[PDB]
């Protein structure tokens, strides 16, 4: 019931560029300690810059490895969380990085690509902007691909429980997606790893499915992470998913026993629509 | 904040038997197509029968392999779902099997052990009944052990969200546990894989933490299952967890794309306290 592109899109890069019609395109790579993979990601996209893509930045989210220098050495403009929006003290987590990135870009369209990807296709970005450029009323495009543990155990089943209309979204937690600035600066940003699911639900609640498309980027592979770190992500995802369905979340961080005790942070605080930051 | 036994319990089998004080003990092994492991499980426990354990049954939950014959050949009494409670048509899923098993046993105490376990300790049952026998006010004992994907990504984080008081339960989805008949026949049984989480939350809501204990059974290993089957389990878990927290579940089955479409069953229907079936 949702515009789904199942096979390779047929649009060429030159067509897509024509279709821009004065609209600009920014690409954001959020990055926290992805030195091993960041360069490969930037290189997959930088050939588009000054063409289809008018602007590409790395939003460095507090990295302490060589993420930033290697990214710079790949010719990318690197922006710290502090630099994107310096008047506002920095909070931890991905959603903060993406939210701040709105203040550090000016494209009418914004594309997000995770910086921990292993050999991403150089057509990811063209594939994602296709529906925004050539559709009508599309404001949001999610990717999917071909094993998604938080997605298949947490997000998809909870959506089935609480927003079953979104059951047709194959990769709701996908980190590769694009959306209009008009949409993005109109929506709040959930903290931490909650940011994607919030955007999907907020978009839907506000514009319905017809405003959402999804595109097959084939197959992704990325940094596989330790189960305890996913419990933490899953917690924040849950937190946000619930607060969008008007359910009071305890605000209690998930506690695991490695036996040694550890309690991960959770946040019930969204960033407001970036629009409010407009002077 | 919950009675937790972290190391090997010190009670001997003969002490525990003395402590029974006229109370009887039934052990139930629910089983659906566990021919490879069922015999090992029965053998771990049958030496206790006519001693500490007064009764042991296998609740055969519709098996079509050699589960039943191999179980019989290990000297176990085998009871079909139909035989446990024949006046009532059989529904699919684990909770149904466990619920029916109450009608097919008469122990004052009931112990559940999954039948897909690989080399279970012969002390599992003594370890589980310890707190029921020697405690006061304990009506429920959960096991834990030393990677628990639905548990760590779905159940523990959701509990943190919705019943954070149960955050201290290490293995809420554990299939090895024991409880009083008085408690069990007083509680409804969630369908499918929802049965455990429901029992934990219902018990807590009704008696609080002081009625619950948990015991380290060291380390379990069992049938590792395909992610898509866990999505289905996770769905039912979610469904039940939500309905206990007064949250309306859509009643919509989880839908996955293997790309081929498949929609798994979910049930919003509990069995009533078995007490109501008392003539
Ligand atoms: O505080 C952070 C954490 C992560 N990231 C970046 O965000 C991307 C995704 O983070 P990651 O740790 O790889 O998350 P995943 O395990 O891949 O989580 C999946 O599901 C999450 C829930 O929405 C999404 O954030 C991810 O994009 C998605 O791939 C990575 O490139 C990170 O460099 C930050 O910039 N800051
Ligand atoms: O319809 C069914 C399904 C399962 N079982 C038996 O129940 C036990 C547990 O089922 P399983 O498929 O192994 O579930 P798990 O993946 O191990 O799920 C974990 O989490 C579940 C959620 O509560 C619990 O039911 C399990 O006991 C627990 O180990 C097994 O011995 C099965 O033989 C049935 O009797 N009938
Ligand atoms: O967002 C998710 O679904 C978790 C991604 O990690 P993985 O389970 O290894 O694919
Ligand atoms: O109940 C659970 O947590 C799922 C058990 O299977 P596994 O993740 O392989 O340990
Ligand atoms: Mn990743
Ligand atoms: Mn199992």
UniProtKB/Swiss-Prot annotation, chains A, B:
The record's keywords, sorted A to Z, are: Calcium, Cobalt, Glycosyltransferase, Iron, Magnesium, Manganese, Metal-binding, Transferase
Q: Binding positions for UDP-alpha-D-glucose?
A: 30-34, 61, 94, 114-115, 193-196, 220-225
At which positions is (2R)-2-O-(alpha-D-glucopyranosyl)-3-phospho-glycerate bound?
94, 148-151, 220
Q: What is this protein called?
A: Glucosyl-3-phosphoglycerate synthase
Cofactor(s) annotated in UniProt: Mg(2+); Ca(2+); Mn(2+); Fe(2+)
Residues annotated as binding (2R)-3-phosphoglycerate are 148-151, 224
The free-text function statement in the UniProt record for this protein reads:
Involved in the biosynthesis of 6-O-methylglucose lipopolysaccarides (MGLPs). Catalyzes the transfer of the glucose moiety from UDP-alpha-D-glucose (UDP-Glc) to the position 2 of 3-phospho-D-glycerate (3-PGA) to form glucosyl-3-phosphoglycerate (GPG).
Q: Does the keyword Cytoplasm apply?
A: no
> Which Gene3D superfamilies does its entry note?
Spore Coat Polysaccharide Biosynthesis Protein SpsA, Chain A
Quote the catalytic activity from the record. Answer: an NDP-alpha-D-glucose + (2R)-3-phosphoglycerate = (2R)-2-O-(alpha-D-glucopyranosyl)-3-phospho-glycerate + a ribonucleoside 5'-diphosphate + H(+); (2R)-3-phosphoglycerate + UDP-alpha-D-glucose = (2R)-2-O-(alpha-D-glucopyranosyl)-3-phospho-glycerate + UDP + H(+)
């Amino acid at each position: 019931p949702l515009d789904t592109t199942w096979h390779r899109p047929g649009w060429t890069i030159g067509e897509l560029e024509a279709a821009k019609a004065g609209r600009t395109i920014s690409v954001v790579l959020p990055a926290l300690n992805e030195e091993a993979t960041i360069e490969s990601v930037i290189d997959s996209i930088s050939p588009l810059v000054d063409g289809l893509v008018d602007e590409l930045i790395v939003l460095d989210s507090g990295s302490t490895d060589d993420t930033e220098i290697r990214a710079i050495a790949s010719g990318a403009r690197v922006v710290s969380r502090e630099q994107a929006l310096p008047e506002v003290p920095v909070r931890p987590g991905k959603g903060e990085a993406l939210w701040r990135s709105l203040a550090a870009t000016s494209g009418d369209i914004v594309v997000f690509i995770d910086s921990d990807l292993i050999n991403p296709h150089p057509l990811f970005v063209p594939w994602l902007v296709g529906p925004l450029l050539t559709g009508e009323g599309i404001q949001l495009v999610k990717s999917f691909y071909r094993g998604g543990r938080v997605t298949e155990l947490v997000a998809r089943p909870l959506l089935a429980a609480l927003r079953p209309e979104l059951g047709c979204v194959l990769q709701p937690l996908s980190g590769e997606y694009a959306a209009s600035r008009e949409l993005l600066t109109s929506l709040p940003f959930a903290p931490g790893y909650g940011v994607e699911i919030g955007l999907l639900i907020d978009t839907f609640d506000r514009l319905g499915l017809d405003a959402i498309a999804q595109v097959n980027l084939g197959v992704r592979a990325h940094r596989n992470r330790p189960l305890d770190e996913l419990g933490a992500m899953s917690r924040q995802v849950i937190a946000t998913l619930l607060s969008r369905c008007g359910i009071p979340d305890s605000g209690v961080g998930l506690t695991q026993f490695l036996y040694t005790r550890h309690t991960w942070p959770v946040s019930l605080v969204d960033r407001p629509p970036m629009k409010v930051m407009r002077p």
